[PDB]
Amino acid sequence: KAIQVAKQVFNTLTEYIQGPCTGNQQSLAHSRLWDAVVGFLHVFAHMQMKLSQDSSQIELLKELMDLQKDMVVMLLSMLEGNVVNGTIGKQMVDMLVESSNNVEMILKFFDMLTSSDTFKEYDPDGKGVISKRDFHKA
Numbered sequence: 001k002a003i004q005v006a007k008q009v010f011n012t013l014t015e016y017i018q019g020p021c022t023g024n025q026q027s028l029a030h031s032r033l034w035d036a037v038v039g040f041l042h043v044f045a046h047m048q049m050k051l052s053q054d055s056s057q058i059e060l061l062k063e064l065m066d067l068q069k070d071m072v073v074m075l076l077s078m079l080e081g082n083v084v085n086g087t088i089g090k091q092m093v094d095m096l097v098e099s100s101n102n103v104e105m106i107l108k109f110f111d112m113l114t115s116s117d118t119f120k121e122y123d124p125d126g127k128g129v130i131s132k133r134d135f136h137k138a
Contacts, residue, residue, distance in 0.1 A: 003063045010070040020080040028078065029088050034095040037071070038102075044068055045105040052109075 016024040044064065051061050078088055096103060118138040123130055
C-alpha cells in the first residue's frame, strides 16, 4: 500500500519534468529529493537481496523493482536538457558518491540472462528440470 503511493508520487514527479520544464527541474535540484533517493537505494539494496531468498514472497519483490524502475525513470527525466558541466549532474554524482556502497550491492545483484548459460552442459535432453546438485556442479 506504500509502494503504490510512492510509485504514483514518482510518476507525478516525472510528469512535471518529462516535457523539459527547466523550472520544475531546478526546483527539484535545490530540494530534499536526493536525501529521499539515498534512503530509497539503501532499502532497495538490502531488501531485494533479503527477500530474494524465500519463494514465499515474490510479488512484493516485483512491486519493489517496479518502484525502482519508476525512480530511475524520474532520474533520467531530470537529465533531458543536460548541459555538459551542469549542476543537476553534479548533484546526482554527489548523491551517488554518498550512497556508493548501497549501489554496489545492486549492481552486484543484477549480475544475473546469466543464469541459464550454465544449464545445458549437464542437461539430459534440454528440458528445464535439472538436478539441485548438477546446478551446483555447473
